[PDB]
Amino acid sequence: PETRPNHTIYINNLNEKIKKDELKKSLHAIFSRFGQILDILVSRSLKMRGQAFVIFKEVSSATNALRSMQGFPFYDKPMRIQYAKTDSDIIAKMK
């Protein structure tokens, strides 16, 4: 099943050995160029490890980010990027 365009991109296949704080910092280092980021959500729990949500202010940023960085080698692993299924809370609280 495919996903529809979204403010938020969902990244998985991330290196699970990286600490939350550093992972957010690094993700920002490479994704900020695509547009203003509202937040980056990372959790190292059993269910949510290896994954991240990057919440852009504009959908065009998310879209550009998804196209350009698909398969990007990151901590020695190719990034897999999709649109999030649903809107992040940060986004609902505006639009």
Partner RNA sequence: AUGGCCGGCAUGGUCCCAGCCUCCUCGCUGGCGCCGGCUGGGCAACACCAUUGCACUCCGGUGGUGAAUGGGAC
Nearer residue to RNA within complex by CB, 25 or 48 = 48
Query: Which position among 45, 76, 94, 95 is part of the footprint of RNA (CB under 7 A)?
Result: 45
Q: Does 47 bind RNA (CB under 7 A)?
A: yes
One DSSP character per residue, 8-46 reads: EEEEES--TTS-HHHHHHHHHHHHGGGS-EEEEEE--ST
Nearer residue to RNA within complex by CB, 30 or 38 = 38
Q: Does 4 bind RNA (CB under 7 A)?
A: no
- Measured from the Cβ of residue 3, the count of other Cβ atoms closer than 10 Å reads 13
Query: Which position among 31, 34, 53, 74 is part of the footprint of RNA (CB under 7 A)?
Result: 53
Q: Does 63 bind RNA (CB under 7 A)?
A: no
Contact by Cβ (8 Å): 83, 9: yes
